[PDB]
Symmetry: C3
Subunit: 259 residues, 3 copies
């Protein structure tokens, strides 16, 4: 292995082989770090998380194959997160409790995944994505930057289940999926779209449109929505909300000009 002298590793932690733990990493009580896990500098790993969780091939003969997991700098992973090998997570990642993340998945930078979320295999999550509590992200889903998935959202992938050909959902830049919504397989939710709470999204959602209901139907442009408190137009949200965003200290327009 390769573990930093500044790493703090609490009681009960179990470490395997070919593990690299960088500087100022703190691994809380009881974590099990399985083989082929690389934890980048400054990260915190919550108690009893299990990192480099076994892929299916392990069970053939109980011999652990090599499926490297890398976690980026400064993660803040909370308790009992389970993360599979063959997955890459970027920097400043943060989680709630008991989150599960499968293999062959890629998660960008400054992403947040709340308590109980279940991210499946072969999932793509871009940067500054915010997934709240108990969100199910099915295999093949593609979540672009700045997307928000609120509690209990479920992204499906088998159009006529059970079947052999899956179609993942693709969620474009800044789209917001409100709580307890379910999206059907292969659906494209376009930029700056808003899917209202509890919707059953059976059709693509056009850019800057609001849909609600079961099945969800277009109700209006996102720009029509007013703040319930202040009466100000809310969307695109990038102009009215910036806590934790990269243009927090400036403004979106100046920010975007720079990138």
């Amino acid at each position: 292995n390769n573990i930093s002298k500044s790493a703090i590793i609490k009681e009960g932690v179990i470490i395997g082989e070919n593990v690299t733990i960088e500087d100022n990493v703190y691994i809380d009580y009881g974590c099990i770090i399985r083989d082929n896990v690389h934890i980048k500098k400054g990260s915190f790993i919550g108690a009893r998380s299990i990192l480099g969780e076994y892929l299916v091939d392990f069970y053939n003969d109980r011999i652990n194959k090599k499926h490297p997991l890398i976690i980026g700098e400064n993660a803040l992973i909370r308790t009992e997160n389970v993360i599979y090998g063959d997955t890459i997570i970027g920097d400043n990642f943060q989680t709630g409790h008991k989150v599960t993340i499968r293999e062959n998945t890629k998660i960008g930078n400054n992403v947040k995944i709340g308590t109980l979320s279940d991210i499946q295999h072969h999932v793509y999550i871009g940067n500054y994505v915010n997934i709240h509590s108990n969100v199910f992200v099915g295999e093949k889903s593609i979540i672009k930057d700045f997307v928000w998935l609120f509690p209990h959202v479920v992204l499906t992938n088998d159009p006529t289940p059970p079947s052999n050909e899956l179609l993942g959902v693709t969620i474009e830049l800044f789209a917001v999926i409100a709580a307890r919504s379910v999206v059907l397989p292969g659906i494209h939710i376009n930029e700056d779209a808003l899917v209202g709470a509890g919707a059953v999204v059976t059709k693509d959602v056009p850019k800057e449109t609001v849909v609600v209901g079961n099945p969800a139907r277009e109700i209006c442009s996102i720009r029509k929505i007013k703040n319930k408190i202040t009466g100000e137009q809310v969307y695109p949200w990038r102009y009215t909300f910036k806590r934790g965003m990269p243009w927090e200290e400036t403004d979106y327009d100046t920010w975007i000009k720079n990138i």
Copy 2:
């Protein structure tokens, strides 16, 4: 610390500083009791629960600030519950497995919180409240006494997400929210109201009214409902159901006269 000689503390338990464990408390295998936790007499804490879980300020410098957690007498907390500091829980509390309860939250007496439920910060839960499996209780929610939240209910708080001003849901005395229902931000669900399974509640619900659907619509008075088995009028439920309630040994009317 201050731990009772009658307390039973199983193998693997980890105890921090400024912890008080009263008489006849039983802490099962592997719990991690973090600093500033007070567990009242006669309580049972399920294996691997983590009590006094770290608030956000801890991560600034990995130095644990003081945020006291108090749990009342006779709790029956099941496995792997995670409970934050700056929270108060009353007596005879009981939980299912893997429940998460955040900080700055207040939970009354004789409350039950089922498996997987995720109770956020700044939540108020009164007495004799029954929250079932995997219920999401958002920040700012106010749940009055005798309310029932059935499996997979979700109480939201950001009316035009993501935004800066949250509005919590308030659920009044005895109201019942059936399974897989979602309530929108700032909604008032009045006394003895019934929200039918799977509803999307977008408007306040008047006292003793039944609403169902997406969006939920008023269908009738609660008093119209008949028991599917016995044909007897069911509601107000306080008159037809009393298992585990304070008037269990008497009757509601005599009971209420006394308080």
Copy 3:
């Protein structure tokens, strides 16, 4: 006890009394095997699972009564599964992470139960049943062979809650319940029926019928559905899908003739 010399039992495992662990069983780090647990040959038990979890009577006096749990051969149970006593699980069972299974429950052979699922007490699950992530299975539910419950499905049982007389849902052979659907108490979902994603099923569903919506309504025969990719008729699914099924190596028709 009775533990096989070929059993592999990792660090931190806690074993009680009257436990039988057969040949080639592998119990991962930190499992707690409570009294009266029988694990059949060749099974794998994921880290930190808790087997023979305490029934309610234990809490009367903290004295553990006898409530035997049996798990069949070749199980592949993943991490942190919690399984109660007075329950029987058949062979080739497999689970995802953090699944909870209560007492007085019977689970057949070649069944799969995904991450977070919460199976209550007095539940019957037949063979080759596939329950996905975070499915709630209420007390009294009866799930026949080959049924599929997709993510976030919830089967209820109190028709006018809270009440004293529960009615479980019965799901017949091969029926498929798509994601985020909720079924009301006492509902009969017949053979080869399809409940579309996110439905609120308030009425029995006839054999080979598709229902969708809130409340769910019949839309067509299952045989009308075409594969979204190939345009081939999909259902009965037993003729178009067989990965992991008993007729995988042959065909359903020849297979059924033999049984």
